[PDB]
Coordinates of all heavy atoms in Angstrom, one line a residue:
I1 N -13.7 -28.3 -16.2 CA -14.5 -29.2 -17.0 C -15.9 -28.7 -17.0 O -16.4 -28.3 -15.9 CB -14.2 -30.7 -16.7 CG1 -15.1 -31.6 -17.5 CG2 -14.6 -31.0 -15.2 CD1 -14.6 -33.1 -17.6
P2 N -16.6 -28.6 -18.1 CA -18.0 -28.2 -18.2 C -18.9 -29.0 -17.3 O -18.8 -30.2 -17.2 CB -18.4 -28.4 -19.7 CG -17.1 -28.2 -20.4 CD -16.0 -28.7 -19.5
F3 N -19.8 -28.3 -16.6 CA -20.8 -28.9 -15.7 C -22.2 -28.9 -16.4 O -22.7 -27.8 -16.7 CB -20.8 -28.1 -14.4 CG -21.8 -28.5 -13.4 CD1 -22.3 -29.8 -13.4 CD2 -22.3 -27.7 -12.3 CE1 -23.2 -30.3 -12.4 CE2 -23.2 -28.1 -11.4 CZ -23.7 -29.4 -11.4
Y4 N -22.6 -30.1 -16.7 CA -24.0 -30.2 -17.3 C -24.9 -30.7 -16.2 O -24.7 -31.8 -15.6 CB -24.0 -31.2 -18.4 CG -23.6 -30.8 -19.7 CD1 -22.4 -30.2 -19.9 CD2 -24.4 -30.9 -20.9 CE1 -21.9 -29.8 -21.1 CE2 -24.0 -30.5 -22.1 CZ -22.7 -29.9 -22.2 OH -22.3 -29.5 -23.5
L5 N -25.9 -29.8 -15.8 CA -26.8 -30.2 -14.7 C -28.1 -30.6 -15.4 O -28.7 -29.8 -16.1 CB -27.1 -29.0 -13.7 CG -28.2 -29.2 -12.7 CD1 -27.8 -30.3 -11.8 CD2 -28.5 -27.9 -11.9
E6 N -28.5 -31.9 -15.1 CA -29.8 -32.4 -15.6 C -30.8 -32.1 -14.5 O -30.6 -32.6 -13.3 CB -29.7 -33.8 -15.9 CG -31.0 -34.4 -16.6 CD -31.0 -35.9 -16.9 OE1 -29.8 -36.6 -16.9 OE2 -32.0 -36.5 -17.2
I7 N -31.8 -31.4 -14.7 CA -33.0 -31.3 -13.8 C -34.1 -32.1 -14.3 O -34.7 -31.9 -15.4 CB -33.4 -29.8 -13.5 CG1 -32.2 -29.0 -13.2 CG2 -34.4 -29.8 -12.3 CD1 -32.4 -27.4 -13.3
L8 N -34.6 -33.1 -13.4 CA -35.9 -33.8 -13.6 C -36.8 -33.3 -12.5 O -36.5 -33.4 -11.3 CB -35.6 -35.3 -13.6 CG -34.9 -35.9 -14.7 CD1 -34.9 -37.5 -14.6 CD2 -35.5 -35.5 -16.1
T9 N -38.0 -32.8 -12.9 CA -38.9 -32.2 -11.9 C -39.8 -33.2 -11.4 O -40.0 -34.2 -12.1 CB -39.7 -31.0 -12.5 OG1 -40.4 -31.6 -13.6 CG2 -38.7 -30.0 -13.0
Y10 N -40.4 -33.0 -10.2 CA -41.4 -33.9 -9.7 C -42.3 -33.1 -8.7 O -41.9 -31.9 -8.4 CB -40.8 -35.1 -9.0 CG -40.1 -34.9 -7.6 CD1 -40.6 -35.4 -6.5 CD2 -38.9 -34.3 -7.5 CE1 -40.1 -35.3 -5.2 CE2 -38.3 -34.1 -6.3 CZ -38.8 -34.6 -5.2 OH -38.2 -34.4 -4.0
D11 N -43.3 -33.7 -8.2 CA -44.1 -33.1 -7.1 C -44.2 -34.1 -6.0 O -44.6 -35.3 -6.2 CB -45.5 -32.7 -7.6 CG -46.3 -31.9 -6.6 OD1 -46.4 -32.3 -5.4 OD2 -46.8 -30.8 -6.9
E12 N -43.8 -33.7 -4.8 CA -43.8 -34.6 -3.6 C -45.2 -35.2 -3.4 O -45.3 -36.3 -2.8 CB -43.5 -33.7 -2.3 CG -42.0 -33.2 -2.3 CD -41.7 -32.5 -0.9 OE1 -42.7 -32.1 -0.2 OE2 -40.5 -32.2 -0.6
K13 N -46.2 -34.5 -3.9 CA -47.6 -35.1 -3.6 C -48.2 -36.0 -4.7 O -49.3 -36.4 -4.6 CB -48.5 -33.8 -3.4 CG -48.3 -33.0 -2.2 CD -49.3 -32.0 -2.0 CE -48.9 -30.9 -1.1 NZ -49.3 -29.5 -1.7
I14 N -47.4 -36.2 -5.8 CA -47.9 -36.9 -7.0 C -46.9 -38.0 -7.3 O -45.7 -37.7 -7.6 CB -48.1 -36.0 -8.2 CG1 -49.1 -34.8 -7.8 CG2 -48.6 -36.7 -9.4 CD1 -49.2 -33.7 -8.9
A15 N -47.3 -39.3 -7.3 CA -46.3 -40.4 -7.4 C -45.9 -40.6 -8.9 O -44.8 -41.0 -9.2 CB -46.9 -41.7 -6.9
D16 N -46.7 -40.2 -9.9 CA -46.6 -40.5 -11.3 C -46.6 -39.3 -12.2 O -47.6 -38.6 -12.4 CB -47.7 -41.5 -11.8 CG -47.6 -41.8 -13.2 OD1 -46.5 -41.7 -13.9 OD2 -48.6 -42.3 -13.8
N17 N -45.4 -38.9 -12.7 CA -45.2 -37.7 -13.5 C -45.7 -37.9 -14.9 O -45.5 -37.0 -15.7 CB -43.8 -37.3 -13.5 CG -42.8 -38.2 -14.3 OD1 -43.2 -39.3 -14.7 ND2 -41.6 -37.7 -14.6
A18 N -46.4 -39.0 -15.3 CA -47.1 -39.1 -16.6 C -48.6 -38.8 -16.4 O -49.4 -38.7 -17.4 CB -47.0 -40.6 -17.2
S19 N -49.0 -38.5 -15.2 CA -50.5 -38.2 -14.9 C -50.9 -36.8 -15.3 O -50.1 -35.9 -15.5 CB -50.7 -38.4 -13.4 OG -50.0 -37.3 -12.7
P20 N -52.3 -36.6 -15.5 CA -52.8 -35.3 -15.9 C -52.6 -34.3 -14.7 O -52.4 -33.1 -15.0 CB -54.3 -35.6 -16.1 CG -54.5 -36.9 -15.6 CD -53.3 -37.7 -15.7
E21 N -52.6 -34.8 -13.5 CA -52.4 -33.8 -12.4 C -51.0 -33.3 -12.3 O -50.7 -32.1 -12.1 CB -52.8 -34.5 -11.1 CG -52.3 -35.8 -10.7 CD -53.2 -37.0 -11.2 OE1 -53.7 -37.0 -12.4 OE2 -53.3 -37.9 -10.5
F22 N -49.9 -34.0 -12.7 CA -48.6 -33.5 -12.9 C -48.5 -32.6 -14.2 O -47.8 -31.6 -14.0 CB -47.5 -34.6 -12.9 CG -46.1 -34.0 -12.9 CD1 -45.6 -33.6 -11.6 CD2 -45.3 -33.9 -14.1 CE1 -44.3 -33.0 -11.6 CE2 -44.1 -33.3 -14.0 CZ -43.5 -32.9 -12.8
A23 N -49.1 -33.0 -15.3 CA -49.0 -32.2 -16.5 C -49.5 -30.8 -16.2 O -49.0 -29.8 -16.8 CB -49.8 -32.8 -17.6
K24 N -50.4 -30.6 -15.3 CA -51.0 -29.3 -15.0 C -49.9 -28.4 -14.3 O -50.1 -27.1 -14.4 CB -52.2 -29.4 -14.1 CG -53.5 -29.9 -14.8 CD -54.6 -30.0 -13.8 CE -56.0 -30.1 -14.5 NZ -56.3 -31.5 -14.9
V25 N -48.9 -28.9 -13.6 CA -48.0 -28.1 -12.9 C -46.6 -28.2 -13.4 O -45.7 -27.6 -12.8 CB -48.0 -28.5 -11.3 CG1 -49.3 -28.1 -10.7 CG2 -47.5 -29.9 -11.0
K26 N -46.4 -29.0 -14.4 CA -45.0 -29.3 -15.0 C -44.3 -28.0 -15.5 O -43.1 -27.8 -15.1 CB -45.1 -30.2 -16.2 CG -43.8 -30.7 -16.7 CD -43.8 -31.7 -17.9 CE -42.4 -32.3 -18.1 NZ -42.2 -32.9 -19.5
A27 N -45.0 -27.1 -16.1 CA -44.3 -25.8 -16.6 C -43.8 -25.1 -15.4 O -42.6 -24.6 -15.5 CB -45.4 -24.9 -17.4
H28 N -44.5 -24.9 -14.4 CA -44.1 -24.2 -13.2 C -42.9 -24.9 -12.6 O -41.9 -24.2 -12.3 CB -45.3 -24.0 -12.2 CG -45.0 -23.5 -10.9 ND1 -44.6 -22.3 -10.6 CD2 -44.9 -24.2 -9.6 CE1 -44.3 -22.1 -9.3 NE2 -44.6 -23.2 -8.7
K29 N -43.0 -26.2 -12.5 CA -41.9 -27.0 -11.9 C -40.6 -26.8 -12.7 O -39.5 -26.6 -12.1 CB -42.2 -28.5 -11.8 CG -43.5 -28.8 -11.0 CD -43.4 -28.5 -9.6 CE -44.6 -29.2 -8.8 NZ -44.7 -28.8 -7.4
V30 N -40.7 -27.0 -14.0 CA -39.5 -26.9 -14.9 C -38.9 -25.5 -15.0 O -37.7 -25.3 -14.8 CB -39.9 -27.3 -16.3 CG1 -38.7 -27.0 -17.3 CG2 -40.2 -28.8 -16.4
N31 N -39.8 -24.5 -15.2 CA -39.3 -23.1 -15.4 C -38.7 -22.5 -14.1 O -37.7 -21.9 -14.1 CB -40.4 -22.2 -16.1 CG -40.8 -22.7 -17.5 OD1 -40.0 -23.4 -18.1 ND2 -42.0 -22.4 -17.9
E32 N -39.4 -22.7 -13.0 CA -38.9 -22.2 -11.7 C -37.6 -22.9 -11.3 O -36.7 -22.2 -10.8 CB -40.0 -22.4 -10.5 CG -41.2 -21.4 -10.7 CD -40.8 -20.0 -10.9 OE1 -40.0 -19.4 -10.2 OE2 -41.3 -19.4 -11.8
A33 N -37.4 -24.2 -11.5 CA -36.2 -24.9 -11.2 C -35.0 -24.3 -12.0 O -33.9 -24.1 -11.4 CB -36.3 -26.4 -11.5
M34 N -35.2 -24.0 -13.3 CA -34.2 -23.4 -14.1 C -33.7 -22.0 -13.6 O -32.6 -21.8 -13.6 CB -34.7 -23.2 -15.6 CG -34.8 -24.6 -16.3 SD -35.8 -24.4 -18.0 CE -34.4 -23.5 -18.9
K35 N -34.7 -21.2 -13.2 CA -34.4 -19.9 -12.5 C -33.5 -20.1 -11.3 O -32.5 -19.4 -11.1 CB -35.7 -19.1 -12.2 CG -36.5 -18.6 -13.3 CD -37.9 -18.2 -12.9 CE -38.7 -17.7 -14.0 NZ -40.2 -18.0 -13.8
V36 N -33.8 -21.1 -10.5 CA -32.9 -21.3 -9.3 C -31.5 -21.6 -9.7 O -30.5 -21.0 -9.3 CB -33.5 -22.4 -8.4 CG1 -32.4 -22.8 -7.3 CG2 -34.7 -21.9 -7.7

């Protein structure tokens, strides 16, 4: 059966992923996770 993996990224140091400080590192979080 097909395996669909959902990745939701976060930063241990940032509580709210809607914040500007998370937006600054989102690309790195998303793209690196996909490589793994």
Side-chain angles (χ1 to χ4, degrees):
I1 180 159
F3 177 25
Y4 277 55
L5 174 64
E6 187 180 348
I7 310 163
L8 289 190
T9 59
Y10 75 109
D11 190 307
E12 293 184 343
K13 293 183 200 143
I14 304 174
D16 180 16
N17 74 347
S19 67
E21 51 267 46
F22 188 78
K24 288 179 162 85
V25 297
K26 192 182 190 197
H28 169 74
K29 308 292 196 190
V30 175
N31 300 334
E32 294 308 311
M34 289 167 72
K35 292 163 179 154
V36 168

